[PDB]
Amino acid sequence: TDRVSVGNLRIARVLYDFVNNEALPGTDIDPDSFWAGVDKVVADLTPQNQALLNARDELQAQIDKWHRRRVIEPIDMDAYRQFLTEIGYLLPEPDDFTITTSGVDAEITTTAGPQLVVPVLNARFALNAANARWGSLYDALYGTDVIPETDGAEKGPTYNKVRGDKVIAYARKFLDDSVPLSSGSFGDATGFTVQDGQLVVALPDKSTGLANPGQFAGYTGAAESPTSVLLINHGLHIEILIDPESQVGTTDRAGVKDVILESAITTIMDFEDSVAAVDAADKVLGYRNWLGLNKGDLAARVLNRDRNYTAPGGGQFTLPGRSLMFVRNVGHLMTNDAIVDTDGSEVFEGIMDALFTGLIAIHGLKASPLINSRTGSIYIVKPKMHGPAEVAFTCELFSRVEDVLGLPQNTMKIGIMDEERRTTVNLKACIKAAADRVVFINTGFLDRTGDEIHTSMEAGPMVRKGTMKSQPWILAYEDHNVDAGLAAGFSGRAQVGKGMWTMTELMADMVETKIAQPRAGASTAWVPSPTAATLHALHYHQVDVAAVQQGLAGKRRATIEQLLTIPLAKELAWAPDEIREEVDNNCQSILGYVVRWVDQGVGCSKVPDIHDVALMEDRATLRISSQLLANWLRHGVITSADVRASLERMAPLVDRQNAGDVAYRPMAPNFDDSIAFLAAQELILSGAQQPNGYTEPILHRRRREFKARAAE
Ligand SMILES: Cc1ccc(F)c(C(=O)/C=C(\O)C(=O)O)c1F
Ligand SMILES: [Mg+2]
Ligand SMILES: [Mg+2]
């Protein structure tokens, strides 16, 4: 049609031209050698990719049947466990080992702090995320509900000094807690100077230095009256800006203008669950943003340069101004018609992402001044893997890609998502398969919950999705992930990460609650916005993660029996009003997410739930909601009438929340006419038949359908 023939492949022209004209120049890779390597890698690895996917289906069919042929009303755990062992689901645990991954940047091996995830197809969000390495604490407190809007402190169209003063007081308390003075409080400071290479703070009746002078990291401006003071605590930097001429500074007792926090230490630029990309045109938009990030010239607003500081001794030094970037590739499941073979078969999308995002990442190892990785690594998050054979396959794919690209072996590092049950229960073997490439493990708990529901779909009805947060299986899974990482030597070598905070407006609650993750020994956890990164950074100043990890060493805190505890609901635990709240809430969140996915190609959206809580949705939260309703429909908790009635009831409410808001197409009243409504319906009624309950097959088909009707 409009394709380019290379060997057995037929490449969409928009992708061929993008690679030749934009991605390849400056890499010293010969274009014809590249495309021949694409041909050879696709041919060589596609059989094993398909075999792994078939093995998923075969395992799930055996588990399905096993549950259907059970009569003994409470599950016999020892029988279930030996069955899983016989069919090859539960594999032997290897002997203890230590990972050997080398060439990794300090932001990953050593620094504990927030990790931000943003959709790579939104250039403005990607830029703000890269720039979120540093963020204003004052803006983050003033603009959110961390400072309550009680009487007097309300936000309005102009500055509220009552509220601003609360902001200042909060930050002063943070400084006392994080960088203590020898005597007195920062609240009473009247000035800062550096004298004989050390920081002295002026109080109203004396002067004082820090309880630990080593927390003084540097300053800007004249040592006489500095323009800022740079502190460090638990490896993260804090900058007090000093400017009495600013409006905030005029009011401040020491002329302080702002407190800047090192925030999003690393950032994951996402090609997976937060974007909608169903063809070559969509992929190229994402590849091109990733290219502009790595070259440094992406602009909508531009990327920040590094920050210059004067050392306490008087010399000069610099600090990175940008978040260290990972890229999340898609996993093993999907194909994309960006490339088809001679038969018209689509090429596996994960294989393509490895080739093209890896190629593009070479630019980030080279000058265009500052770069990405000063130590020479490329950082790829690989999601949705099931078990160690699937991890071994990713490592071989990366190896073959390094060869095509002329890169040293093990340049391409792997952030392993622990977000599928067969990976959880074989986690040690999964780490071992990537022992020379792994740079993190992370509990992707939302995907993990969807896999929990689908895997035991035949077992019975599951608890409500709000109950999953506290079920035995997920508490064991969180502790097990930390134990396995620490036992593999992750302390000082690789990140131990936990999952995403989705209530974008509930920042007071995040600051109160999310501290549990570093208290659990996690050296990183996921945030949805630059503002959330700045606030989550407070937690790493309160919690000494390095100390926590050392205290956790050698502990075995989860048993296989706990990991395998299926979240079945007990006998009729639900009144009719509770069942309908669950159905309505799930249909509302499904419809609000899917309508912007199908009609507008937006892969992450804030969707208010039934309690009017704004939730950041992507495919993982959709997987949970659709699988839970499919499970309730499968075991008779609800009827097919109940599902259809709820969809029809919530759809006009979703229509209203998107009313006017740009060229949006209402779903109501012509339900059977809306591709988006039909996609939402299909995700529920066909959910039990989707592979591992994944949502991409239906989403991609329905988005391509909508694009075709928008052209005829
Ligand atoms: C930006 C955003 C919002 C909501 C999410 F759930 C995710 C996500 O992808 C989480 C996992 O991967 C998982 O828990 O499975 C996200 F990146
Ligand atoms: Mg996930
Ligand atoms: Mg400390």
XYZ file of C-alpha atoms and ligand atoms in Angstrom:
731
model
C 0.000 0.000 0.000
C 2.308 2.739 1.347
C 4.936 0.414 2.819
C 8.646 -0.245 2.323
C 9.934 -3.768 1.646
C 12.977 -4.851 3.675
C 13.492 -8.594 3.558
C 10.313 -10.254 4.807
C 9.049 -6.992 6.379
C 6.763 -4.262 5.012
C 7.377 -1.081 7.004
C 4.876 1.751 7.233
C 6.407 4.658 5.328
C 5.926 7.158 8.158
C 8.031 4.887 10.394
C 10.669 4.163 7.717
C 11.164 7.888 7.065
C 11.221 8.814 10.757
C 13.954 6.282 11.489
C 16.099 7.235 8.476
C 15.671 11.014 8.666
C 15.410 11.598 12.449
C 16.473 8.608 14.579
C 19.488 7.243 12.693
C 21.523 10.426 11.894
C 24.180 10.973 14.543
C 24.379 7.348 15.752
C 27.009 6.234 13.186
C 24.809 3.196 12.445
C 24.498 2.357 8.767
C 20.830 2.602 7.697
C 20.843 -0.556 5.589
C 22.602 -2.558 8.310
C 20.006 -1.324 10.797
C 17.020 -2.387 8.715
C 18.615 -5.751 7.956
C 19.045 -6.194 11.711
C 15.351 -5.430 12.244
C 14.492 -8.088 9.642
C 16.773 -10.681 11.269
C 15.735 -9.976 14.884
C 12.022 -10.093 14.035
C 12.453 -13.369 12.135
C 14.664 -14.946 14.807
C 12.702 -14.077 17.970
C 9.036 -14.106 16.899
C 8.680 -17.927 17.363
C 9.755 -17.814 21.023
C 7.531 -14.761 21.638
C 4.499 -16.661 20.325
C 5.466 -19.785 22.292
C 5.596 -17.838 25.555
C 2.150 -16.364 24.899
C 0.767 -19.833 24.136
C 2.197 -21.103 27.431
C 0.199 -18.439 29.305
C -3.022 -19.676 27.663
C -2.212 -23.341 28.392
C -1.474 -22.647 32.061
C -4.635 -20.562 32.490
C -6.781 -23.290 30.927
C -5.462 -25.876 33.397
C -6.099 -23.578 36.378
C -9.580 -22.744 35.016
C -10.450 -26.446 34.778
C -8.906 -27.258 38.170
C -11.209 -24.754 39.884
C -14.324 -25.913 38.010
C -13.793 -29.511 39.136
C -13.435 -28.648 42.832
C -16.201 -29.602 45.248
C -14.500 -29.287 48.670
C -15.827 -25.901 49.663
C -12.707 -24.287 51.223
C -9.652 -24.627 48.999
C -7.029 -27.159 50.067
C -3.839 -25.093 49.902
C -1.436 -28.059 49.814
C -3.342 -29.622 46.906
C -3.494 -26.315 45.011
C 0.214 -25.725 45.630
C 1.282 -29.144 44.347
C -0.944 -28.761 41.287
C 0.715 -25.434 40.432
C 4.099 -27.128 40.898
C 3.203 -30.055 38.639
C 2.012 -27.911 35.702
C 5.159 -25.769 35.831
C 3.505 -22.617 37.196
C 5.392 -22.773 40.511
C 9.065 -23.337 39.741
C 11.995 -24.239 42.013
C 13.639 -21.388 43.903
C 17.325 -20.914 42.966
C 20.166 -20.685 45.445
C 21.070 -17.308 46.926
C 22.909 -14.899 44.631
C 23.938 -11.257 44.193
C 23.189 -9.146 41.104
C 26.168 -7.994 39.038
C 24.611 -5.046 37.150
C 27.283 -2.409 36.463
C 27.501 1.013 34.867
C 24.398 2.352 36.633
C 23.862 5.994 37.574
C 23.806 7.076 41.218
C 20.147 8.128 40.960
C 19.342 4.388 40.728
C 22.020 2.629 42.794
C 22.130 5.020 45.724
C 19.579 7.856 45.885
C 16.207 7.058 47.458
C 13.424 9.311 46.193
C 10.286 9.750 44.077
C 9.893 8.253 40.585
C 7.488 10.029 38.202
C 5.588 8.298 35.356
C 4.196 10.313 32.417
C 2.784 9.475 28.966
C 5.447 9.960 26.315
C 2.885 11.052 23.686
C 2.153 14.300 25.620
C 5.169 16.492 24.898
C 4.273 19.174 27.461
C 3.839 16.655 30.297
C 7.049 14.856 29.293
C 8.979 18.143 29.449
C 7.554 19.094 32.856
C 8.443 15.603 34.124
C 12.046 15.787 32.922
C 12.225 19.198 34.642
C 10.672 17.894 37.894
C 14.066 16.967 39.380
C 13.664 20.294 41.230
C 10.337 21.683 42.384
C 9.004 24.489 44.556
C 7.836 23.326 47.991
C 5.900 26.584 48.442
C 3.937 26.117 45.223
C 3.202 22.492 46.143
C 1.835 23.435 49.584
C -0.024 26.608 48.565
C -1.709 25.075 45.553
C -2.929 21.822 47.122
C -4.954 20.735 50.133
C -1.871 19.953 52.264
C -2.546 23.386 53.778
C -6.280 23.144 54.583
C -8.572 25.858 53.240
C -10.038 26.606 56.668
C -11.502 30.007 57.546
C -8.931 32.611 56.557
C -6.626 30.376 54.514
C -8.877 29.964 51.460
C -7.437 30.116 47.968
C -8.713 32.907 45.761
C -7.836 34.777 42.569
C -5.122 36.702 44.455
C -2.488 35.829 47.049
C -3.858 35.060 50.528
C -1.171 36.030 53.039
C -2.878 34.102 55.840
C -2.415 31.001 53.692
C 1.088 31.961 52.543
C 2.176 32.309 56.171
C 0.953 28.765 56.898
C 2.981 27.623 53.884
C 6.095 29.305 55.294
C 5.556 27.817 58.760
C 5.151 24.309 57.320
C 8.435 24.606 55.405
C 10.225 26.006 58.477
C 9.109 22.947 60.446
C 10.364 20.712 57.620
C 13.777 22.398 57.847
C 13.944 21.904 61.625
C 13.045 18.239 61.150
C 15.469 17.587 58.261
C 18.487 19.891 58.772
C 18.437 20.735 62.502
C 20.134 23.821 63.890
C 22.547 23.495 66.793
C 20.196 25.642 68.899
C 16.866 27.266 68.114
C 14.547 26.919 65.135
C 14.592 28.006 61.504
C 11.282 29.695 62.298
C 13.245 32.390 64.163
C 16.059 32.803 61.616
C 16.830 36.342 60.455
C 19.665 35.689 57.993
C 22.126 33.234 56.491
C 25.837 33.711 55.804
C 28.768 31.391 55.129
C 31.864 32.113 57.220
C 35.066 30.040 56.987
C 33.381 27.442 54.793
C 30.443 26.793 57.123
C 26.845 27.950 57.411
C 25.893 30.295 60.243
C 22.228 31.167 60.828
C 21.233 34.434 62.523
C 18.742 34.159 65.371
C 17.262 37.208 67.157
C 19.678 37.011 70.128
C 22.589 34.814 68.970
C 24.003 32.909 65.997
C 24.175 29.175 65.407
C 25.332 26.577 62.912
C 23.913 23.214 61.880
C 23.906 20.280 64.283
C 25.740 18.531 61.419
C 27.886 20.934 59.348
C 28.075 18.193 56.719
C 24.507 18.978 55.672
C 25.762 22.295 54.281
C 26.334 21.456 50.606
C 26.969 24.873 49.061
C 25.491 28.219 48.111
C 25.048 30.786 45.359
C 25.978 34.460 45.247
C 28.466 36.229 47.468
C 29.449 34.465 50.682
C 28.608 37.803 52.379
C 24.851 37.576 51.844
C 24.195 34.452 49.733
C 21.346 34.337 47.244
C 20.608 30.733 48.252
C 21.776 28.004 50.609
C 22.053 24.371 49.494
C 21.534 21.613 52.055
C 21.587 17.831 51.781
C 19.757 15.192 53.812
C 19.518 11.430 53.162
C 21.134 12.132 49.769
C 18.494 14.641 48.580
C 19.166 18.360 48.142
C 17.258 21.283 49.685
C 17.678 24.871 48.502
C 16.610 27.908 50.521
C 16.189 30.826 48.105
C 17.028 34.211 49.676
C 15.517 37.317 48.114
C 14.054 40.103 50.302
C 12.868 42.007 47.194
C 10.319 39.334 46.249
C 6.766 39.634 47.530
C 7.079 36.493 49.673
C 10.584 37.498 50.744
C 9.455 40.966 51.837
C 7.115 39.356 54.374
C 9.609 36.725 55.578
C 11.601 37.245 58.770
C 14.790 36.150 56.985
C 13.865 37.247 53.444
C 13.386 33.638 52.297
C 11.535 33.455 48.977
C 11.023 29.706 48.489
C 12.286 26.271 49.490
C 13.249 24.138 46.472
C 13.294 20.358 46.815
C 15.056 17.742 44.732
C 11.938 15.804 43.761
C 11.550 13.487 40.743
C 14.993 11.878 40.879
C 14.069 9.535 38.000
C 11.210 9.643 35.491
C 9.643 6.888 33.382
C 8.646 8.063 29.897
C 5.745 5.720 29.130
C 4.917 3.936 25.879
C 2.608 1.491 27.689
C -0.422 1.758 29.948
C -0.741 5.565 29.973
C -0.771 6.115 26.162
C -3.081 5.126 23.300
C -1.009 4.235 20.222
C -2.580 1.791 17.796
C -0.692 2.281 14.494
C 2.507 3.630 12.941
C 1.362 7.269 13.065
C 0.771 6.991 16.823
C 4.056 5.171 17.482
C 6.011 7.778 15.514
C 4.555 10.611 17.625
C 5.838 8.843 20.730
C 9.204 7.861 19.246
C 9.744 11.475 18.175
C 9.084 12.877 21.672
C 11.484 10.288 23.127
C 14.045 11.381 20.515
C 13.697 15.064 21.391
C 14.098 14.229 25.077
C 17.329 12.327 24.422
C 18.736 14.935 22.046
C 17.675 17.686 24.453
C 15.794 19.867 21.951
C 12.186 18.866 22.660
C 10.180 22.074 22.914
C 6.514 22.965 23.201
C 8.765 25.410 26.977
C 12.186 23.716 27.026
C 14.350 21.354 29.071
C 16.363 22.781 31.960
C 20.137 23.040 32.143
C 22.222 21.905 35.098
C 22.435 24.045 38.235
C 25.635 25.809 39.321
C 26.686 26.084 42.964
C 29.646 27.325 44.971
C 31.028 24.674 47.299
C 31.289 25.402 51.046
C 35.080 25.573 50.637
C 34.800 28.100 47.801
C 35.247 25.932 44.717
C 32.636 25.362 42.038
C 30.462 22.343 41.289
C 27.299 21.429 39.395
C 24.177 19.324 39.916
C 21.833 17.713 37.359
C 18.820 19.828 36.522
C 16.851 17.014 34.876
C 15.305 13.758 36.015
C 17.215 10.651 34.928
C 14.998 9.044 32.274
C 13.756 5.472 31.899
C 11.467 4.473 29.026
C 8.642 1.963 29.595
C 8.351 -0.317 26.536
C 5.249 -2.408 25.892
C 5.305 -6.025 27.078
C 5.189 -9.324 25.218
C 1.489 -9.447 24.207
C 0.579 -7.067 21.426
C 1.376 -6.771 17.747
C 1.191 -3.540 15.759
C 0.652 -3.073 12.025
C 3.404 -0.427 11.904
C 5.270 -3.402 10.391
C 3.666 -6.447 8.763
C 5.312 -9.426 7.101
C 4.587 -10.683 3.579
C 1.531 -12.606 4.819
C 0.125 -9.435 6.373
C 0.868 -10.630 9.920
C 1.571 -7.806 12.354
C 4.982 -7.659 14.049
C 5.302 -7.992 17.849
C 5.229 -4.486 19.330
C 7.586 -5.213 22.231
C 10.262 -6.331 19.771
C 9.827 -3.092 17.837
C 9.969 -0.945 20.974
C 13.294 -2.530 21.961
C 14.783 -1.740 18.543
C 13.448 1.793 18.158
C 13.534 3.114 21.754
C 16.991 1.567 22.146
C 18.209 3.187 18.928
C 16.819 6.560 20.008
C 18.411 6.312 23.469
C 21.923 6.407 21.951
C 21.416 10.163 21.532
C 21.100 10.492 25.317
C 24.607 9.080 25.779
C 26.063 11.910 23.652
C 26.369 15.688 23.771
C 23.426 17.842 22.627
C 26.473 19.477 26.873
C 24.273 17.638 29.298
C 22.862 14.192 28.458
C 20.935 11.396 30.240
C 23.231 8.652 31.607
C 26.780 9.734 32.422
C 27.751 6.100 33.101
C 26.686 4.766 29.687
C 23.423 2.876 30.362
C 20.023 2.785 28.643
C 17.113 2.207 31.067
C 14.081 0.220 29.862
C 11.108 -0.733 32.062
C 9.653 -4.046 30.857
C 6.054 -4.548 32.062
C 3.575 -7.452 32.293
C 6.057 -10.340 32.262
C 4.920 -13.763 33.569
C 7.745 -15.807 35.118
C 11.493 -16.228 34.531
C 11.394 -17.642 30.995
C 9.683 -14.424 29.918
C 12.421 -12.440 31.687
C 15.149 -14.482 29.970
C 13.484 -13.705 26.631
C 13.566 -9.942 27.275
C 17.276 -10.193 28.076
C 17.974 -12.064 24.824
C 15.943 -9.501 22.852
C 18.028 -6.718 24.425
C 21.242 -8.619 23.602
C 20.288 -9.019 19.943
C 19.295 -5.343 19.796
C 22.645 -4.233 21.256
C 24.346 -6.168 18.433
C 22.234 -4.480 15.741
C 22.972 -1.096 17.315
C 26.710 -1.672 17.791
C 26.414 -1.174 21.589
C 28.359 -2.957 24.328
C 26.562 -5.977 25.722
C 24.435 -5.138 28.825
C 24.098 -1.453 27.870
C 20.288 -1.856 27.905
C 19.210 -2.286 31.539
C 15.847 -3.658 32.728
C 13.443 -2.305 35.315
C 11.369 -5.404 36.130
C 7.687 -4.855 36.917
C 6.420 -7.395 39.488
C 2.816 -7.094 38.362
C 1.718 -10.622 37.351
C 1.114 -13.545 39.722
C 3.452 -16.006 37.977
C 6.262 -13.464 38.408
C 5.430 -12.824 42.094
C 5.615 -16.502 43.053
C 8.847 -17.003 41.052
C 10.359 -13.585 41.795
C 13.830 -14.784 42.846
C 14.213 -16.760 39.613
C 12.981 -13.718 37.652
C 15.656 -11.467 39.160
C 18.298 -14.141 38.555
C 17.425 -14.353 34.847
C 18.343 -10.657 34.566
C 21.054 -10.580 37.236
C 23.464 -8.601 35.020
C 20.829 -6.175 33.643
C 18.274 -5.510 36.397
C 18.104 -1.945 37.737
C 14.859 -2.217 39.697
C 11.926 -4.314 40.745
C 8.611 -2.555 41.337
C 5.281 -3.791 42.694
C 2.849 -2.669 40.023
C -0.039 -3.444 42.358
C -2.878 -2.424 40.039
C -1.944 -4.774 37.184
C -1.168 -7.343 39.885
C -4.741 -7.064 41.158
C -6.188 -7.597 37.680
C -4.057 -10.706 37.265
C -5.197 -11.916 40.684
C -8.839 -11.706 39.593
C -8.368 -13.275 36.163
C -6.126 -16.132 37.312
C -8.694 -17.328 39.893
C -11.696 -16.248 37.806
C -13.300 -19.715 38.006
C -12.745 -20.011 41.762
C -15.703 -17.919 42.889
C -16.764 -14.313 43.348
C -14.046 -11.929 44.545
C -14.205 -9.228 47.206
C -15.066 -5.666 46.178
C -12.163 -3.859 44.562
C -11.823 -1.412 47.477
C -11.262 -4.449 49.742
C -8.352 -5.771 47.652
C -6.022 -3.126 49.140
C -6.014 -5.032 52.463
C -6.318 -8.684 51.390
C -3.680 -11.139 52.673
C -2.317 -11.901 49.161
C -1.356 -8.288 48.414
C 0.223 -7.629 51.793
C 2.391 -10.732 51.347
C 3.231 -9.717 47.765
C 4.494 -6.277 48.866
C 6.730 -7.704 51.628
C 7.918 -10.590 49.414
C 9.102 -8.151 46.727
C 11.245 -6.191 49.214
C 12.664 -9.380 50.772
C 13.670 -10.768 47.372
C 15.312 -7.526 46.253
C 17.264 -7.072 49.492
C 18.339 -10.729 49.421
C 19.643 -10.246 45.857
C 21.852 -7.353 47.017
C 19.748 -4.456 45.748
C 20.892 -2.155 48.584
C 23.434 0.121 46.938
C 22.946 -1.469 43.487
C 19.307 -1.166 42.330
C 15.911 0.304 43.210
C 13.238 -1.428 45.284
C 10.069 0.338 44.141
C 6.381 0.509 45.037
C 3.272 1.686 43.243
C 1.264 4.667 42.102
C -0.766 7.194 44.086
C -3.848 7.832 41.927
C -5.908 10.406 43.910
C -4.389 13.432 42.215
C -6.205 16.027 44.334
C -5.870 14.273 47.717
C -2.407 15.574 48.528
C -3.004 15.890 52.293
C -3.854 12.185 52.338
C -0.820 11.324 50.207
C 1.514 13.125 52.621
C -0.181 11.357 55.544
C -0.312 7.858 53.993
C 2.361 7.302 51.310
C 5.131 7.453 53.944
C 4.363 3.762 54.464
C 6.273 2.897 51.291
C 9.742 4.157 52.339
C 8.988 2.840 55.841
C 8.643 -0.579 54.139
C 12.176 -0.284 52.738
C 11.264 0.954 49.249
C 13.952 3.192 47.760
C 11.452 4.609 45.261
C 7.728 4.826 44.609
C 5.493 6.170 41.873
C 3.859 9.609 41.681
C 1.575 11.020 38.963
C 2.624 14.695 38.743
C 5.600 16.993 39.411
C 3.653 18.421 42.371
C 3.153 14.939 43.823
C 6.895 14.270 43.424
C 7.779 17.369 45.501
C 5.411 16.345 48.301
C 6.448 12.672 48.262
C 10.070 13.853 48.609
C 9.176 14.975 52.145
C 8.834 11.292 53.051
C 12.437 10.422 52.154
C 13.677 13.194 54.459
C 11.630 11.745 57.324
C 12.512 8.079 56.681
C 16.096 6.786 56.408
C 15.450 4.162 53.736
C 19.069 2.959 53.732
C 18.798 2.284 57.472
C 15.394 0.619 57.007
C 16.758 -1.730 54.339
C 19.674 -2.773 56.544
C 17.289 -3.658 59.376
C 15.187 -5.745 56.969
C 18.161 -7.808 55.763
C 17.796 -11.580 55.926
C 14.105 -11.615 56.873
C 11.580 -14.011 55.321
C 8.256 -12.282 55.880
C 5.917 -13.927 53.328
C 5.129 -17.605 52.812
C 4.053 -19.124 49.516
C 0.762 -20.003 51.214
C 0.159 -16.318 51.940
C 1.080 -15.262 48.405
C -1.371 -17.843 47.043
C -4.334 -16.810 49.254
C -7.124 -16.160 46.723
C -9.314 -13.044 47.553
C -12.646 -14.886 47.496
C -15.589 -13.159 49.156
C -17.331 -14.924 52.005
C -20.933 -16.053 51.895
C -23.391 -13.283 50.899
C -21.443 -10.395 52.428
C -23.315 -7.761 50.395
C -26.676 -6.059 50.691
C -28.314 -4.991 47.403
C -27.218 -1.372 47.884
C -23.588 -2.452 48.311
C -23.678 -4.531 45.116
C -25.126 -1.663 43.128
C -22.573 0.811 44.498
C -19.823 -1.518 43.285
C -21.410 -2.002 39.847
C -22.164 1.704 39.309
C -18.722 2.794 40.522
C -16.959 0.313 38.261
C -19.048 1.182 35.181
C -18.516 4.902 35.760
C -14.743 4.618 35.946
C -14.636 2.256 32.940
C -16.785 4.569 30.797
C -14.951 7.743 31.801
C -11.597 6.224 30.860
C -12.624 4.313 27.730
C -14.522 7.189 26.080
C -11.414 9.405 25.939
C -9.286 6.409 24.925
C -11.402 5.391 21.934
C -12.666 8.772 20.717
C -9.572 10.909 21.404
C -6.583 8.560 21.731
C -5.869 9.719 25.320
C -4.382 6.921 27.408
C -4.538 8.489 30.888
C -7.343 10.700 32.242
C -8.507 11.992 35.618
C -11.937 10.386 36.132
C -14.087 11.175 39.210
C -15.494 8.052 40.809
C -18.920 7.597 42.448
C -17.678 9.510 45.513
C -16.467 12.409 43.305
C -12.811 11.515 44.015
C -10.605 12.431 41.042
C -8.675 9.290 40.067
C -5.892 9.104 37.476
C -6.936 6.126 35.324
C -4.834 4.085 32.911
C -5.159 0.542 31.534
C -4.204 -1.138 34.827
C -7.092 0.386 36.782
C -9.363 -0.494 33.850
C -8.126 -4.101 33.970
C -9.223 -4.311 37.619
C -12.675 -2.808 37.086
C -13.563 -4.835 34.002
C -12.227 -8.089 35.464
C -14.130 -7.617 38.737
C -17.469 -7.084 36.958
C -16.712 -10.014 34.621
C -16.072 -12.120 37.743
C -19.289 -10.999 39.447
C -21.235 -11.696 36.241
C -19.554 -15.129 35.940
C -20.673 -16.324 39.391
C -24.135 -14.752 39.407
C -23.638 -11.819 41.788
C -25.153 -9.606 39.064
C -27.211 -10.181 35.913
C -26.512 -9.054 32.365
C -29.457 -6.691 32.814
C -27.682 -5.184 35.835
C -24.525 -4.471 33.794
C -26.332 -2.912 30.831
C -28.572 -0.775 33.057
C -25.553 0.551 34.967
C -23.661 1.392 31.775
C -26.686 3.282 30.442
C -27.164 5.067 33.752
C -23.579 6.284 34.164
C -22.889 7.135 30.499
C -24.871 10.432 30.459
C -23.122 11.391 33.687
C -19.771 10.833 31.961
C -21.140 12.767 28.970
C -21.733 15.747 31.268
C -18.238 15.734 32.784
C -16.842 15.974 29.228
C -19.563 18.297 27.922
C -18.267 21.016 25.625
C -14.737 20.169 26.860
C -13.318 20.111 23.297
C -14.821 18.228 20.332
C -16.159 15.315 22.420
C -18.869 12.965 21.136
C -21.657 12.157 23.635
C -22.396 8.479 24.174
C -26.074 8.983 25.082
C -28.753 8.571 23.919
C -27.623 6.474 20.938
C -25.727 3.843 22.902
C -25.503 1.249 20.126
C -24.112 4.019 17.860
C -21.118 4.878 20.087
C -17.947 2.878 19.448
C -16.699 3.995 22.883
C -19.821 2.738 24.700
C -19.557 -0.579 22.865
C -15.879 -0.877 23.798
C -16.723 -0.382 27.470
C -19.489 -2.982 27.240
C -17.227 -5.492 25.467
C -14.504 -5.120 28.108
C -16.981 -6.393 30.725
C -19.042 -8.989 28.831
C -15.983 -10.451 27.060
C -13.606 -9.887 29.979
C -13.420 -13.530 31.030
C -12.188 -14.470 27.528
C -9.430 -11.866 27.218
C -5.886 -13.253 27.590
C -4.967 -12.792 31.264
C -7.750 -10.190 31.304
C -5.712 -7.709 29.244
C -7.586 -4.702 27.841
C -5.360 -3.827 24.865
C -6.967 -6.235 22.329
C -10.389 -4.600 22.656
C -9.058 -1.054 23.126
C -6.782 -1.223 20.088
C -9.449 -2.771 17.844
C -12.084 -0.215 18.925
C -9.728 2.784 18.571
C -8.747 1.645 15.058
C -12.460 1.254 14.295
C -13.149 4.823 15.445
C -10.248 6.150 13.359
C -11.645 4.403 10.284
C -15.116 5.918 10.718
C -13.582 9.369 11.288
C -12.154 9.174 7.744
C -15.027 7.756 5.639
C 0.365 7.342 35.346
C -0.306 6.112 35.911
C -1.542 6.203 36.528
C -2.149 5.066 37.036
C -1.508 3.837 36.935
F -2.101 2.742 37.429
C -0.260 3.738 36.327
C 0.451 2.407 36.164
O 0.828 2.072 35.020
C 0.693 1.472 37.304
C 1.150 0.211 37.113
O 1.980 -0.132 36.039
C 0.475 -0.919 37.837
O 0.178 -0.787 39.072
O 0.226 -1.984 37.210
C 0.336 4.883 35.815
F 1.532 4.793 35.230
Mg 1.252 -2.007 35.288
Mg 18.526 10.998 59.254
